[PDB]
Amino acid sequence: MRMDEFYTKVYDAVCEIPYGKVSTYGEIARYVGMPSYARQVGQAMKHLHPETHVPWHRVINSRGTISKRDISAGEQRQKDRLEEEGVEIYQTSLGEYKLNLPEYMWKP
DNA sequence: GCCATGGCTAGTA
DNA sequence: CTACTAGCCATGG
Numbered sequence: 103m104r105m106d107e108f109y110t111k112v113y114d115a116v117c118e119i120p121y122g123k124v125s126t127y128g129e130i131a132r133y134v135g136m137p138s139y140a141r142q143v144g145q146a147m148k149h150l151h152p153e154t155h156v157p158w159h160r161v162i163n164s165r166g167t168i169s170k171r172d173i174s175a176g177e178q179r180q181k182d183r184l185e186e187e188g189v190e191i192y193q194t195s196l197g198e199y200k201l202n203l204p205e206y207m208w209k210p
Numbered sequence: 211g212c213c214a215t216g217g218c219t220a221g222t223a
Numbered sequence: 224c225t226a227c228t229a230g231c232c233a234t235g236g
Binding site for chain 2: 126127128131139140141142143144145146147148158161162163164165168169170171172174177180
Binding site for chain 3: 138141
């Protein structure tokens with residue numbers, strides 16, 4: 103399965119997720135049948151054009167945190183796009199962001 | 211061939 | 224609960 107294919111398959115999927123609900127890199131990685139590949143899922147979400155009509159924000163790590171991203175300081179962007187979804191978000195004095203996973207976790 | 215680098219994850223302290 | 228190691232694997236220099 104050549105890249106671009108995979109790239110599509112993933113996208114088709116993140117359009118599948120419902121408002122408010124969410125998934126992780128781990129999970130989409132296996133959903134499309136390519137489990138060893140979340141790494142390449144962050145990868146796919148990075149490759150997105152910002153004014154995309156895709157729930158790029160509804161995908162976090164398995165720890166149920168927001169990931170770093172660096173070259174988009176406004177990784178923060180991902181948060182508020184989600185409070186615009188009814189999801190309560192906090193942190194630690196580690197000052198990350200976290201959430202009640204098995205609640206909002208997208209169970210298909 | 212080499213390395214290093216990511217929006218990762220799971221295991222094990 | 225954090226904290227660190229190992230694997231993981233595309234992309235680019």
